[PDB]
């Protein structure tokens, strides 16, 4: 494999903690966290970090492309301007290398999937969330993720899940769909059925072993436990859908960018 | 009655109205606000409870626009409007200050998102525009989102960033030697990690939040600083807020207008 994942969201949503908690890694050493004095006009930069990881015989080269500074400025206008240019750049790099007379070894840096994180503190999708997803759902597979699920009770999780699903339906956002299964397997058909009913995945990230979880004076949040958060469902969906995510990136989004650019 | 005016600054949904119901043990009119509001505005309601005439001034639409540049005028213009209303009442020849309704904001609770890092850029700019206008009490809204290990480093970065930008926050009076020891640890736990809840869980009837891994007791000091935030409701602390509002903030605005008026 050679999979590329993009992470987008406000700072302080546990994104770095989540992407680390997936394959139990540490992609962000010496993480420079700026202060509020240098964040009012902090532009959105793109910093990639590729990591090797073997998952039950599935050895893959995971390249994570974070977008530090998204939605942390006073005026978040054109915050998603650099994210757009990078994705189209990777499509252009692939279009140049595929059209050239020497395509023996090509670096495939196209973004196959893009996690977008939603703050659980508010009531639903914010204008920054809507104007981002609508401006990128036709170029990359958007996967909505409710960050920091452990601040929402049972009733609050189902309330926020259903609302931001209506707002996605209302604004016409094309998030990444999970493919339907054919008879085939019965247990796998039940697993993919609960994945469709759990989206948007309200997840929790933690690197502390206690069996990963978070410690509170009133209790312990079990990350790997589905009854507490949808971490295991997001991780399971990622591994089982890396093929489809890669294929839809090539056969759909890339081909649409190709046809659009060939007329320019 | 005791005219105490509170202003809740906080992003939409951070639990401003929930904490007010939790703190006064009642249920104020608390309709939610959507994230689709073109600009930050203020909604103020008046209530007569206990006996005091409470005025809660909430921030409607805060931190939702994509362009949050001009999201400070409506706050400052309101706080300056109440100062001008009190000042113009003084200038009146046949004035009635005893029956005049003092609508000046005495205390202002700032709800910080429980991100864990520090203050957003919106937080620093908003507090530096109001540090010379109102008594600012910063709190960490939805404090249960943060563990006690992270909460230690969080209050560290918050206090550090505030005292590095020269943001004048409110401190509780230590002049009285009796309240000296209690208001010492009181000021030492700012920002108050607060958790608001209107639901009750069986215990021996108690305000708490029910998670599948535990229950967060709002009135438990080891869970949250709500027990300490409730200390601002005593008569001496409320009087100190009104004292400082008129002695420092309003008198500053009064000396400004008297210069402009020549
Ligand atoms: N994790 C956590 N959730 C809370 C807490 N307090 C309230 N909530 C939840 O978040 C929601 C907050 O609602 P409000 O208090 O009305 O939000 P608000 O601050 O008034 O924002 P506006 O509606 O725009 O005025 C509630 O419905 C609760 O379910 C808290 O202390 N911790
Ligand atoms: N309550 C809660 N806190 C979390 C979770 N994940 C991470 N955190 C805390 O959030 C803080 C910062 O998270 P971080 O990943 O650096 O934020 P981000 O990288 O900007 O998205 C850390 O100190 C974590 O302890 C979660 O699922 N729930
Ligand atoms: Mg409210």
Swiss-Prot record, chain A:
The organism's place on the tree of life at top rank: Eukaryota
Record note on modification: Ubiquitinated by park, leading to its degradation by the proteasome.
Signal peptide: none
Primary residence: cytoplasm
GO molecular function, one term: GTPase activity
Binding site for GTP: 9-16, 43, 69, 148-156, 205, 214
Region called G3 motif, residue ranges: 66-69
Sorted UniProt keywords: Cell cycle, Cell division, Cytoplasm, GTP-binding, Nucleotide-binding, Phosphoprotein, Ubl conjugation
Tissues of expression: Accumulates at the leading edge of the cleavage furrow in dividing cells and cellularizing embryos (at protein level). Also accumulates at the leading edge of the embryo epithelium during dorsal closure, in the embryonic neurons, and at the baso-lateral surfaces of ovarian follicle cells (at protein level).
Any single biological process term in GO: protein localization
GO cellular component: cell division site; cleavage furrow; microtubule cytoskeleton; septin complex; septin ring
Chain intervals for the UniProt region annotation (G1 motif): 9-16
Family: Belongs to the TRAFAC class TrmE-Era-EngA-EngB-Septin-like GTPase superfamily. Septin GTPase family.
Protein name: Septin-1
Originating organism: Drosophila melanogaster
UniProtKB/Swiss-Prot annotation, chain B:
GO cellular component: cell division site; microtubule cytoskeleton; septin complex; septin ring; spindle
Keyword terms: Cell cycle, Cell division, Cytoplasm, Cytoskeleton, GTP-binding, Mitosis, Nucleotide-binding
Positions that bind GTP: 10-17, 39, 61, 142-150, 196, 209
Chain spans, region G4 motif: 141-144
Domain Septin-type G: 1-260
Region (G3 motif): 58-61
Gene Ontology MF annotations: actin filament binding; GTP binding; GTPase activity; molecular adaptor activity; protein homodimerization activity
Superkingdom as given in the UniProt entry: Eukaryota
Residue span of region Important for dimerization: 213-223
Localization per record: Cytoplasm; Cytoplasm, Cytoskeleton, Spindle
Biological-process GO terms, alphabetical: actomyosin contractile ring organization; border follicle cell migration; cellularization; cytoskeleton-dependent cytokinesis; growth of a germarium-derived egg chamber; imaginal disc development; protein localization; regulation of cell cycle
Region span, G1 motif: 10-17
Segments traversing the membrane: none
Family under the similarity heading: Belongs to the TRAFAC class TrmE-Era-EngA-EngB-Septin-like GTPase superfamily. Septin GTPase family.
Binding partners and assembly: May assemble into a multicomponent structure.
Function: Involved in cytokinesis.
Protein name: Septin-2
Source organism per UniProt: Drosophila melanogaster (Fruit fly)
Lineage of source species: Eukaryota, Metazoa, Ecdysozoa, Arthropoda, Hexapoda
Full-sequence portion shown in this chain: 41 to 308 of 419
């Amino acid at each position: 494999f050679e999979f590329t994942l993009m992470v987008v969201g406000e700072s302080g949503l546990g994104k770095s903690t989540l992407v680390n908690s997936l394959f139990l890694t540490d992609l962000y050493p010496e993480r420079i966290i700026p202060d509020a004095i240098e964040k009012q006009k902090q532009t959105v930069k793109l910093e990639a970090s590729t990591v090797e990881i073997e998952e039950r015989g599935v050895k893959l080269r995971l390249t994570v492309v974070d977008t530090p500074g998204f939605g942390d400025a006073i005026d978040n206008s054109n915050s998603f301007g650099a994210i757009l240019e990078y994705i189209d750049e990777q499509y252009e790099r692939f279009l140049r290398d595929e059209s050239g007379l020497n395509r023996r070894n090509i670096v495939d840096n196209r973004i196959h999937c893009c996690f977008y994180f939603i703050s659980p503190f508010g009531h639903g999708l914010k204008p920054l969330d809507v104007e981002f997803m609508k401006k990128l759902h036709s170029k990359v597979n958007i996967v909505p993720v409710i960050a920091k699920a452990d601040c929402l009770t049972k009733k609050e999780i189902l309330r926020l899940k259903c609302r931001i699903m209506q707002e996605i339906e209302s604004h016409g956002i094309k998030i990444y769909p999970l493919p339907d299964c054919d008879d085939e397997d019965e247990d796998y058909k039940e697993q993919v059925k609960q994945l469709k009913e759990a989206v948007p995945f309200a997840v929790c990230g933690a690197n502390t072993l206690l069996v990963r979880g978070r410690l509170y004076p009133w209790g312990v949040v079990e990350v790997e436990n589905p009854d507490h958060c949808d971490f295991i469902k997001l991780r399971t969906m990622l591994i089982t859908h890396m093929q489809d995510l890669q294929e839809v990136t090539q056969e759909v989004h890339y081909e649409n960018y190709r046809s659009d650019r060939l007329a320019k | 009655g005791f005219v105490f005016n509170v202003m809740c600054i906080g992003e939409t949904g951070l639990g401003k109205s929930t904490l007010m119901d939790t703190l006064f043990n009642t249920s104020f009119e608390s309709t939610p606000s959507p994230h689709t509001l073109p600009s930050v505005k203020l909604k103020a309601h008046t209530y007569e409870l206990q006996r005091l005439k409470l005025t809660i001034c909430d921030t409607v639409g805060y931190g939702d626009q994509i362009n949050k540049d001009d999201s400070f005028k409506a706050v400052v213009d309101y706080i300056d409007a109440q100062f001008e209303n009190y000042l113009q009442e003084e200038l009146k020849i046949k004035r009635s200050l005893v029956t005049c309704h003092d609508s000046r904001i005495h205390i202002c609770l700032y709800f910080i998102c429980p991100t864990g890092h520090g203050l957003k850029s919106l937080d620093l700019v908003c507090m530096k525009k109001l540090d010379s206008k109102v008594n600012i009490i910063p709190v960490i809204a939805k404090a249960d989102t943060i563990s006690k290990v992270e909460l230690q480093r969080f209050k560290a970065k918050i206090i550090q960033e505030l005292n590095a930008n020269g943001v004048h926050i409110y401190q509780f009076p230590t002049d009285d030697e009796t309240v000296a020891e209690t208001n010492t640890s009181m000021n030492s736990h700012i920002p108050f990690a607060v958790v608001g809840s209107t639901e009750f869980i069986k215990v021996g009837l108690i305000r708490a939040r029910q998670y599948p891994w535990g229950t967060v007791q709002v009135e438990n000091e080891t869970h949250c600083d709500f027990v300490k935030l409730r200390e601002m409701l005593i008569r001496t602390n409320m009087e100190d807020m009104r004292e400082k509002t008129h002695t420092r903030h309003y008198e500053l605005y009064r000396q400004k207008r008297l210069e402009q008026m020549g």
